[PDB]
Amino acid sequence: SGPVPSRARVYTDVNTHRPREYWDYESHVVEWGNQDDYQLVRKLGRGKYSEVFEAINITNNEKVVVKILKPVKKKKIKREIKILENLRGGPNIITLADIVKDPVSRTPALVFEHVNNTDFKQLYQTLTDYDIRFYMYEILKALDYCHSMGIMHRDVKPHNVMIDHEHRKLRLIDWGLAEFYHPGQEYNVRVASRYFKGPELLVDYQMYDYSLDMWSLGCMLASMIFRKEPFFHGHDNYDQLVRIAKVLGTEDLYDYIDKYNIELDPRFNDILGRHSRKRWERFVHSENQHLVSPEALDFLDKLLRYDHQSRLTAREAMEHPYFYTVVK
Amino acid sequence: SGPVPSRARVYTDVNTHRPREYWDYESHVVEWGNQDDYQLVRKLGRGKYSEVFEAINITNNEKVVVKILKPVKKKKIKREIKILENLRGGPNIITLADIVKDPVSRTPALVFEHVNNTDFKQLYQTLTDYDIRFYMYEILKALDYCHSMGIMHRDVKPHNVMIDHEHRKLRLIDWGLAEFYHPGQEYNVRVASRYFKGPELLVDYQMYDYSLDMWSLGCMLASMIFRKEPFFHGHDNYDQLVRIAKVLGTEDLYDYIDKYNIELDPRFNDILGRHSRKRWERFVHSENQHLVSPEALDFLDKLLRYDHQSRLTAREAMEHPYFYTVVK
Ligand SMILES: CC(C)n1c2c(c3c1-c1c(Br)c(Br)c(Br)c(Br)c1C3=O)C(=O)CCC2
Numbered sequence: 001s002g003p004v005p006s007r008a009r010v011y012t013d014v015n016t017h018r019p020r021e022y023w024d025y026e027s028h029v030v031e032w033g034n035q036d037d038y039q040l041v042r043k044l045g046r047g048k049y050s051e052v053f054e055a056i057n058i059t060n061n062e063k064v065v066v067k068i069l070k071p072v073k074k075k076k077i078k079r080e081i082k083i084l085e086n087l088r089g090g091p092n093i094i095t096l097a098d099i100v101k102d103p104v105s106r107t108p109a110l111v112f113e114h115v116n117n118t119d120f121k122q123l124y125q126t127l128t129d130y131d132i133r134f135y136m137y138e139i140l141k142a143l144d145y146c147h148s149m150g151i152m153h154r155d156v157k158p159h160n161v162m163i164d165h166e167h168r169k170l171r172l173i174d175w176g177l178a179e180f181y182h183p184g185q186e187y188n189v190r191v192a193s194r195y196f197k198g199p200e201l202l203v204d205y206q207m208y209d210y211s212l213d214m215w216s217l218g219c220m221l222a223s224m225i226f227r228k229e230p231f232f233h234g235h236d237n238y239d240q241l242v243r244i245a246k247v248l249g250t251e252d253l254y255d256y257i258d259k260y261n262i263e264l265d266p267r268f269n270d271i272l273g274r275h276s277r278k279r280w281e282r283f284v285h286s287e288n289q290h291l292v293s294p295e296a297l298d299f300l301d302k303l304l305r306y307d308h309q310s311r312l313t314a315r316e317a318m319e320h321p322y323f324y325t326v327v328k
Numbered sequence: 329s330g331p332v333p334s335r336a337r338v339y340t341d342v343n344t345h346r347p348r349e350y351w352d353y354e355s356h357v358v359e360w361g362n363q364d365d366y367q368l369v370r371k372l373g374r375g376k377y378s379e380v381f382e383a384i385n386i387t388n389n390e391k392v393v394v395k396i397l398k399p400v401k402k403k404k405i406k407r408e409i410k411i412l413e414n415l416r417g418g419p420n421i422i423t424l425a426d427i428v429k430d431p432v433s434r435t436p437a438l439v440f441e442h443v444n445n446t447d448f449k450q451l452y453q454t455l456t457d458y459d460i461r462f463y464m465y466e467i468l469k470a471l472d473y474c475h476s477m478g479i480m481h482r483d484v485k486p487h488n489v490m491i492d493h494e495h496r497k498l499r500l501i502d503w504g505l506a507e508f509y510h511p512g513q514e515y516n517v518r519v520a521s522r523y524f525k526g527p528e529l530l531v532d533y534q535m536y537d538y539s540l541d542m543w544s545l546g547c548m549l550a551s552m553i554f555r556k557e558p559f560f561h562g563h564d565n566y567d568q569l570v571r572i573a574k575v576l577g578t579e580d581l582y583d584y585i586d587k588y589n590i591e592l593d594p595r596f597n598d599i600l601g602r603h604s605r606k607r608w609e610r611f612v613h614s615e616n617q618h619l620v621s622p623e624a625l626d627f628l629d630k631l632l633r634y635d636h637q638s639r640l641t642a643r644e645a646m647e648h649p650y651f652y653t654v655v656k
């Protein structure tokens with residue numbers, strides 16, 4: 001019969017009511033800046049798609065971050081540029097300041113506002129209960145904004161959340177995997193990092209939506225309150241779904257694949273098995289108990305659902321009791 | 329009430345005093361040459377509307393430039409051909425030598441005189457004050473001629489000015505966006521590159537005229553005397569008008585839209601803000617001061633006005649003190 005279709009329960013048609021130019025990024029024309037305006041100071045890191053440098057805008061002596069792209073389809077570059085320009089000025093969205101043409105790689109280089117990030121492997125160990133609530137709220141601001149603008153990030157994870165902790169400042173970065181949501185569109189399921197892939201990606205259900213990001217957020221939250229980073233630590237995609245099922249239980253998983261008539265890859269047969277849904281109390285211990293509370297567990301439970309349609313929206317999440325004190 | 333109409337203050341009726349055939353390009357019949365007269369030597373570049381090749385005319389062994397056109401309405405090809413033929417032989421106008429059509433693919437190719445251009449990214453950094461005055465004067469010759477022939481270029485920018493610096497030769501090229509001026513005609517505002525769009529284009533005032541080109545010229549001049557390319561560096565069309573208003577001030581802008589009863593797009597409301605008119609001295613520094621003079625600033629100020637009717641004409645511009653030494 002084929003899989004049952006699905007639609008986002010919020011922001012479903014926002015791109016259809018936009019002018020064509022907003023989401024038809026293949027027709028976007030890039031206006032290049034002057035690359036001699038920037039001198040590279042030092043390398044900050046390397047990724048699958050890019051190399052990242054701290055640089056100086058010599059016209060005004062301002063610090064910037066330059067992401068020199070590795071070779072990829074021009075269509076994906078246009079997509080990332082168009083999404084960054086659509087989202088510019090939104091709450092906690094990284095600001096694209098310029099686009100130049102690297103003299104060495106002859107590839108594009110994206111210039112971004114600078115952020116003085118504290119590395120998460122050292123930050124998350126020091127975060128208090130209130131810090132986790134605060135930064136979760138900031139991330140939710142960014143996510144609700146981009147979802148309301150018809151865009152899903154599809155790569156939410158700690159490495160893509162820059163935090164200047166001294167100033168309580170947060171930026172959601174790396175939009176190279178983001179896409180425009182259109183109702184009925186089938187998307188590539190090979191997105192996001194393995195530890196943060198939603199079950200819809202792991203069972204190969206292509207008609208997903210904004211709710212994918214929410215699953216990733218839950219994973220992050222799980223790793224923060226239980227002090228286990230990453231929380232679902234699978235060795236591959238199959239073992240990733242297995243690790244998830246050992247916590248969430250197999251009954252809801254099979255109900256999920258039955259509801260959407262999903263054809264389960266045969267390889268799962270001999271590895272999913274039968275697993276009960278566990279209570280979160282089994283992950284609590286003396287070193288993490290100060291971060292775990294009834295409110296946090298209720299919120300986490302409402303994020304980590306197999307059925308993408310049953311997960312909280314970003315706005316619903318922002319209205320949860322877990323955040324009352326942050327809301328002031 | 330609607331917008332207040334406008335007319336060019338010079339060359340207003342030149343096309344109406346012409347035979348219909350001069351400006352009625354929709355009825356133009358193309359005189360085709362033989363495509364086998366030309367052999368392509370090498371590719372020189374790629375554009376939005378065309379690909380550009382160096383080629384050899386084998387009947388007379390002469391070097392030429394071939395612009396193979398991408399798919400476009402036949403009426404626009406007729407327009408470009410008719411304008412090129414009307415302007416052929418004019419001062420510093422590129423010469424159209426032939427028009428051919430691949431007998432198999434049926435795609436059209438325009439053949440042009442060859443010019444040994446030095447790319448502006450390397451030329452403009454080496455230009456002296458006198459060089460800038462000289463080449464501005466040459467561009468003004470071309471512009472006054474085409475305006476006097478009832479034609480506005482609508483795409484003036486460095487990429488469309490070919491300069492053979494060894495021979496002090498200059499050609500204004502790429503007339504694919506040019507149009508005939510008719511009093512009372514409303515034109516498409518989606519013309520020119522972002523950084524060179526006049527305010528009339530950005531506020532959607534359709535009854536513009538030759539003076540549009542003058543705004544573009546001012547932009548070029550600014551970037552050359554201040555060594556700042558582009559001068560108005562907007563992120564999009566809206567932010568482009570914002571960049572302009574941060575230099576020329578918002579008060580003259582609102583006086584402009586009041587004079588012509590222009591309906592401002594509501595989105596400008598939250599981005600234009602309040603800005604004072606800046607003095608040009610803020611763009612002068614140790615690396616460009618040898619190119620900036622009182623005469624240059626006076627001329628520039630008289631080019632970059634919101635009100636298109638208050639900008640210098642090409643001839644008035646040619647009579648400015650900035651050019652006395654060039655006039656000899
Ligand atoms: C972890 C760090 C080295 N980093 C990486 C990336 C990016 C960064 C980074 C930092 Br730090 C800052 Br601050 C800003 Br602002 C911006 Br934008 C970025 C960015 O895009 C990748 O895209 C992949 C490789 C890792």
Ligand SMILES: CC(C)n1c2c(c3c1-c1c(Br)c(Br)c(Br)c(Br)c1C3=O)C(=O)CCC2
Binds near residue numbers: 442
């Ligand atoms: C920058 C260069 C490669 N170039 C481009 C174009 C054109 C040229 C060019 C050159 Br050089 C010369 Br010499 C002559 Br003569 C003429 Br006519 C042209 C011309 O029309 C485009 O139209 C768009 C793509 C870039």
